[PDB]
């Protein structure tokens, strides 16, 4: 038993990080087989930060003017190309540990571990969620860009985020491996500002669950709801819309408790009103947001 | 800026892990040079845990009654030995992966990461605290007996931790690399519980230190304090005594922030008398004590 924030086991990754330098810049790169992807913000200068035009920078460049360094080997760069927002630098090796790997897109309310590296080298590992604003609650220092988040599920490595930027609220934003943004960011200085943020409401469900699971029954009650007066609900919190799919979901959590997703709202309803009252839930005082169905059934018996 | 807990990686010691049958027993254990280490327990049947002899069911066995697997990879063990509660395997082959290890012994109140072990496969990371009442509060399965904890320095894994059971309130305990218990438990089925925990000091106010860093600010106040005046209220809180090589060891965070620990006393004096006054404090309702000094030092500079 016990229940805990969990991040995926980082070795796999580990052996892809490099660092890579263009003018006075060095960031983080990623190197699968020959190639290593990193942010095209690499090839920035001072004034090419409100309105680069990147297409004009980049076709100035010789792969001479990238020095990528792989612990203490400088691999040779022999292509270079863009795609999106990401920049693709072709080497002359391969990366003998490769792992078995997938580039992936991922919806707000999915769950994914970061390796947080500096210089090439990484520094620790930890859980984020996609938040519905389309940012992650990070902790990026300068020298992070070009850091990666991960699933891993069955010896397979799902590659889903890449870092390129903190926002002023001190919130973080990038793009996946194709290079394209999550939410409507773009890299530029220019003033740029997150959406008011909500609650994964179907994810603190699945951790009401997990609290059953292991022991705890204290904030259940004897009452259910529709589907529409619970959302009427818990929008007034600025919680998201629970939808049918959501519901769907939270079937196997249901039957293996058996109390309906519906009693479970209900439950939801009466904590948003009343608070804990001095108690916990699995070492909590808030309501937990970033563990997904599927990372319950995965951490539980 | 942002702030996590975070785990270091794990690859290091993800390439360390194997499995071990003795009977019908499974579990994990730790191949470094060439010697395999796991929890002595492993020899035992269901009716051996009530009341054990190891000595005697040890001298009846042979290194044939042990199998251990190393990917899809048989070791041959060719020896074997006890030290304290810890089995010794001695294998015909030396780890190619061995990194730059010692075996360490930690105190109450610091930090490490553990990774989480199913049939010899890691399956996931977290950071714990070593408990003022010597227990771990992790989330574990059955089979995940063997998993490890460790700190990295520079190159060089410190290994603390090898787990060995679970405790009727959910919390967990285990042994050093050479086998001696954290706390008063022993290695059988018998009634066993833990002591009355206690909140550690030192690292909620390293906690408060990280707030401030991060543009959390609102809990603070004009005022300052006295180690004694402050223990007082400690003591009645079920807090540990701060000491004077507490105070020091925050001097790093006092200089950074413009706050001396005995003014963040103040702050913390109220909190726990008055209470958080509704807020929380880098996304928590509860003031927490899982991170210490130079876990925030590291992460924010
Ligand atoms: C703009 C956005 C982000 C960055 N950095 C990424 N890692 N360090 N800095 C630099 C300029
Ligand atoms: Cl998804
Ligand atoms: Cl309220």
Aim: glycine share 8%; with cysteine.
């Amino acid at each position: 038993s016990g229940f805990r924030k969990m991040a995926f086991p980082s070795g796999k990754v580990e052996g892809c990080m490099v660092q890579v330098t263009c003018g006075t810049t060095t960031l983080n790169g990623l190197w699968l087989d020959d190639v290593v992807y990193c942010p095209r913000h690499v090839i920035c200068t001072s004034e090419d930060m409100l309105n680069p035009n990147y297409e004009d920078l980049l076709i100035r460049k010789s792969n001479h003017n990238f020095l990528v360094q792989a612990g203490n080997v400088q691999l040779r760069v022999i292509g270079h190309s863009m795609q999106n927002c990401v920049l693709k630098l072709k080497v002359d090796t391969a990366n003998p540990k490769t792992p078995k790997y997938k580039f992936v897109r991922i919806q707000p309310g999915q769950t994914f571990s970061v390796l947080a590296c500096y210089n090439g080298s990484p520094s620790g590992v930890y859980q984020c969620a996609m938040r519905p604003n389309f940012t992650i609650k990070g902790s990026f220092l300068n020298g992070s860009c070009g850091s990666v988040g991960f699933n891993i599920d069955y010896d397979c490595v799902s590659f889903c985020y890449m870092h390129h930027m903190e926002l002023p609220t001190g919130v973080h934003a990038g793009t996946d491996l194709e290079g394209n943004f999550y939410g409507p960011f773009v890299d530029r200085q220019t003033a740029q500002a997150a959406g008011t943020d909500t609650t994964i409401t179907v994810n603190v469900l699945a951790w009401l669950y997990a609290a059953v699971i292991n022991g705890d029954r204290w904030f259940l009650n004897r009452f259910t709801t529709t589907l529409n007066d619970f959302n009427l609900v818990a929008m007034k919190y600025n919680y998201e819309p629970l939808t049918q799919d959501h519901v769907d979901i939270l079937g196997p959590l249901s039957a293996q408790t058996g109390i309906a997703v519906l009693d479970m709202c209900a439950s939801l309803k009466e904590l948003l009103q009343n608070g804990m009252n001095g108690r916990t839930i699995l070492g909590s005082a808030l309501l937990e947001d970033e563990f997904t169905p599927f990372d319950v059934v995965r951490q539980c018996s």
